[PDB]
Amino acid sequence: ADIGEVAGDAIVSFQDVFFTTPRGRYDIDIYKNSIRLRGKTYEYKLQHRQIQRIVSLPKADDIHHLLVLAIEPPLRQGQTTYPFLVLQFQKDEETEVQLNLEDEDYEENYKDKLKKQYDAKTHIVLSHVLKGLTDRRVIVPGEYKSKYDQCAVSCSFKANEGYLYPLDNAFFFLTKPTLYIPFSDVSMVNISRTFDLEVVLRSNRGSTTFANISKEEQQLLEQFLKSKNLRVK
């Protein structure tokens, strides 16, 4: 369970990052073509192109900020598979770092991708670096505001309570499990003190229900989802 020796050749490292999914502390060592996640029990290597999507959202707890990475293939921890990695930072923790890149290399190969020197909130530095190396856009909260200006509403999926973010183009739920449902997949939304939101998928794939959403949220949630020409009911 020694995590390992200093990652001296990494472009940049983020030590002791709290991952909520999978749950553990990982060092994130970022290289030219890959990222290594090093923990005391498990470790992984990802190719940049393996990151399919990057989502950056404030946590509903007013304290943390989350970065969510959709990965293909998913990551395996024993018999459990993880198509999303969820990283958590305190919203105001900061990283000041000079990238480990020689001047010539930086100029020829990274100048439009990365900064030489970062000094910002850690989640911002990491998302900037990942956007630069993976070429994926970073998805952020959109136009949806609850009643009480929040990015997400509390609910349950199966036996597990969590938070549902109506993003500009998708439903995003975390954490057990983590779910991303693009609106393009949504046949209709069967709606039904609290209420339930059944996301009926196109082509009879089934439904994903986000249950026990406060009734204090239903009309706004309805108006937004309407604004996306989905269905409702």
Coordinates of all heavy atoms in Angstrom, one line a residue, residues 25 31 65 85 94:
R25 N -8.6 7.6 -2.2 CA -7.7 8.7 -2.4 C -6.7 8.3 -3.5 O -6.0 7.2 -3.4 CB -6.9 9.0 -1.1 CG -7.8 9.6 0.0 CD -8.0 11.0 -0.3 NE -8.8 11.6 0.8 CZ -8.8 12.9 1.1 NH1 -8.2 13.8 0.3 NH2 -9.6 13.3 2.1
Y31 N 0.4 12.9 -17.8 CA 1.5 12.7 -18.7 C 1.1 13.2 -20.1 O -0.1 13.5 -20.3 CB 1.9 11.3 -18.8 CG 2.5 10.8 -17.5 CD1 1.7 10.3 -16.5 CD2 3.9 10.9 -17.2 CE1 2.3 9.8 -15.3 CE2 4.5 10.5 -16.1 CZ 3.6 9.9 -15.1 OH 4.2 9.5 -13.9
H65 N -16.7 21.1 -5.0 CA -16.9 21.1 -6.4 C -16.5 19.8 -6.9 O -15.5 19.2 -6.5 CB -16.0 22.2 -7.0 CG -16.5 22.6 -8.4 ND1 -17.4 23.7 -8.6 CD2 -16.2 22.1 -9.6 CE1 -17.6 23.7 -9.9 NE2 -16.9 22.8 -10.5
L85 N -15.8 8.6 -13.3 CA -15.0 8.8 -12.2 C -15.5 10.2 -11.6 O -15.8 11.1 -12.4 CB -13.6 9.0 -12.6 CG -13.0 7.8 -13.4 CD1 -11.6 8.1 -13.6 CD2 -13.2 6.5 -12.7
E94 N -6.8 25.5 -3.7 CA -6.1 26.1 -4.8 C -4.8 25.3 -5.1 O -4.2 24.7 -4.3 CB -5.7 27.6 -4.5 CG -7.0 28.4 -4.4 CD -6.6 29.9 -4.2 OE1 -5.5 30.2 -3.9 OE2 -7.5 30.7 -4.3

